[PDB]
């Protein structure tokens with residue numbers, strides 16, 4: 001899994017990937033389908 | 049109102065493909081009226097129906113609308129944004145960059161019922177297609193405290209822009225047609241209104257508990273409740289869980305007490321819901337805490353060490369085929385309080401290795417292990433920055449278990465080092481391995497400690513061999529502190545004794561407790577110095593308090609209420625039903641219950657206390 005420079009400098013988990021919004025100057029994750037939250041840290045609660 | 053959805057916190061993170069992401073937004077917000085959390089609308093493309101958002105009345109967190117290409121976001125009945133959580137440190141509503149390589153996207157954001165953003169400011173940046181929003185008077189939506197904290201930018205020369213309706217207040221609307229004229233309920237108003245209004249005149253005043261405007265004068269006539277909606281009344285706070293017991297003069301269990309679910313007061317927590325010490329129903333606890341069932345209802349409690357993180361260790365698992373902690377290594381051990389295996393620190397760390405393509409590690413980074421509290425295998429330190437006089441990164445190491453031991457003999461080994469002192473002030477157990485402290489030609493205190501008190505298997509020995517001589521340190525004046533006990537030293541400082549000769553203050557060894565002359569005043573209990581409670585008035589040359597808590601002061605700093613010393617007399621607290629408890633203070637500073645026919649409060653005894 002990949003080191004991602006967000007506000008709280010975590011890691012995108014559950015197979016997700018780090019991406020950069022150039023417009024803003026801000027990082028975020030690209031979660032795999034079926035996972036939620038900024039760092040992809042949560043099962044969708046319905047999608048399983 | 050009703051119907052409640054959880055909200056999202058994805059900030060700008062994107063969920064699968066644009067479709068995947070649209071489908072989530074959808075299933076989250078479908079038929080939802082009240083958002084408990086936040087509303088983040090992002091990445092939505094041209095010609096995707098966001099009709100479902102027509103349904104949203106209250107958002108509790110913040111509203112983030114960014115990186116969209118949709119022409120139209122119909123937040124048409126969004127009434128209030130509470131801003132209980134900000135975006136980017138300060139905005140309750142951020143509407144940032146809603147275009148694509150073309151200069152198009154959000155044209156339309158018809159928020160004709162947005163009347164109050166309760167907390168937080170508002171930001172608009174780079175929406176070269178957004179119409180009419182240009183014109184709004186935020187002075188009516190946003191509270192003055194966040195007025196000087198807005199970033200406002202709408203930068204199109206022309207466009208698909210209809211002028212507002214002639215029937216609009218100083219030319220402000222959210223879009224085309226009368227339906228979109230901005231409804232003002234705070235600007236135009238009345239000296240007399242201390243809140244919001246139904247119109248230009250004094251009789252139009254809304255109750256102070258209403259948030260966006262009202263349909264009348266009552267607390268049941270509010271459009272939205274400023275704080276809590278308990279049944280069909282707006283209130284300041286939910287009926288308290290704790291109530292005032294006149295017989296204990298402290299807070300007791302309130303059977304008529306209600307928890308707090310969004311801006312609602314409930315009899316009990318829904319679905320699968322934990323409770324906070326704000327008295328709130330929530331889906332999950334914060335990061336600095338994590339608890340289970342404490343008599344029936346699941347409560348949230350504090351880990352007071354940074355929450356337990358189990359981490360691999362050198363040799364096993366993800367760190368397999370690694371010689372020691374490295375530059376490549378040492379990040380992966382951040383919030384780690386326990387090592388499920390060994391810890392090696394070897395010369396190759398601080399010199400670096402050609403073979404494994406590993407730069408020398410920066411000696412300041414060693415501070416990442418300050419959190420580690422248990423090593424399960426063994427600890428082996430064979431190198432260490434010479435600049436560093438201490439094993440201080442392991443300051444808080446409580447236990448080494450030795451379940452595995454170096455060469456199958458050693459649980460702790462400190463070898464060929466420059467240190468002055470073993471920094472291990474929190475070490476209390478080394479159960480099943482032998483100890484090796486060797487070649488540390490400057491290490492001075494390792495003898496003072498009785499290693500035998502630390503062992504858990506009755507066959508383990510020590511080898512404090514080939515350090516300095518007992519004679520050397522003694523002469524260098526490098527002994528235990530005069531305030532330690534025979535038990536030992538992990539170094540020179542008073543913070544560094546195993547146990548105290550006289551008295552402990554929190555963590556340090558000390559001579560006097562602050563009985564007659566200290567900073568805050570103290571008592572002693574089990575040869576510890578414990579602070580007096582802040583309501584004990586310090587006594588010159590005499591004892592200030594006689595235990596913990598407020599019924600142990602010799603004299604109250606402020607007021608007396610039964611056996612308590614209190615900062616203020618009880619003023620409008622919840623009671624053993626029918627009313628709020630109200631006391632005044634008598635010239636002796638004793639609190640006494642106001643006359644029952646008051647209700648507003650009083651300033652003295654009897655009916656002469658509360659005037660009309």
Ligand SMILES: *[C@@H]1O[C@H](CO)[C@@H](O[C@@H]2O[C@H](CO)[C@@H](O[C@@H]3O[C@H](CO)[C@@H](O)[C@H](O)[C@@H]3O)[C@H](O)[C@H]2NC(C)=O)[C@H](O)[C@H]1NC(C)=O
Pocket residue numbers: 367368369370371372373374375376377396397401404406
């Ligand atoms: C300092 O720590 C880093 C992080 O552990 C170490 O890097 C790791 O080195 C090992 C051994 O060279 C690599 O694992 C190997 O993978 C091969 C697959 O071909 C496998 O057959 C071997 O048995 C072995 O497990 C690993 O890729 C590598 N990890 C990273 C991210 O670099 C480094 O070895 C350590 N150096 C020192 C001086 O302790």
Ligand SMILES: *[C@@H]1O[C@H](CO)[C@@H](O[C@@H]2O[C@H](CO)[C@@H](O[C@@H]3O[C@H](CO)[C@@H](O)[C@H](O)[C@@H]3O)[C@H](O)[C@H]2NC(C)=O)[C@H](O)[C@H]1NC(C)=O
Pocket residue numbers: 335336354355382383
């Ligand atoms: C994992 O390690 C990181 C990095 O050391 C830790 O970051 C820490 O983040 C917290 C935020 O909650 C900081 O707490 C402090 O809160 C007080 C009180 O509000 C405030 O005055 C401080 O400015 C600060 O935000 C903590 O100091 C900070 N550490 C560093 C190096 O600045 C974090 O503790 C760890 N994460 C977990 C969940 O254990």
Ligand SMILES: *[C@@H]1O[C@H](CO)[C@@H](O[C@@H]2O[C@H](CO)[C@@H](O)[C@H](O)[C@H]2NC(C)=O)[C@H](O)[C@H]1NC(C)=O
Pocket residue numbers: 588589590
């Ligand atoms: C500390 O406490 C005791 C009170 O129990 C003080 O001693 C009393 O002082 C008054 C003088 O105004 C005498 O009338 C009492 O007879 C004393 N009581 C006893 C039992 O001796 C003592 O004064 C206090 N110390 C200080 C500095 O005020």
Ligand SMILES: *[C@@H]1O[C@H](CO)[C@@H](O)[C@H](O)[C@H]1NC(C)=O
Pocket residue numbers: 286287288291302303304305306622623624625626627628
């Ligand atoms: C009765 O006590 C309850 C405890 O839940 C409290 O909420 C309420 O304020 C009291 N009654 C009134 C109307 O003051």
Ligand SMILES: *[C@@H]1O[C@H](CO)[C@@H](O)[C@H](O)[C@H]1NC(C)=O
Pocket residue numbers: 549550559560
């Ligand atoms: C400090 O320690 C000694 C015991 O070794 C004791 O005599 C003394 O009372 C203690 N406290 C003070 C006031 O020095």
Ligand SMILES: *[C@H]1O[C@H](CO)[C@@H](O)[C@H](O)[C@H]1NC(C)=O
Pocket residue numbers: 434435436466467468490
């Ligand atoms: C290593 O420790 C010794 C002994 O305490 C100290 O005098 C010396 O300065 C240290 N060496 C370096 C290079 O910092």
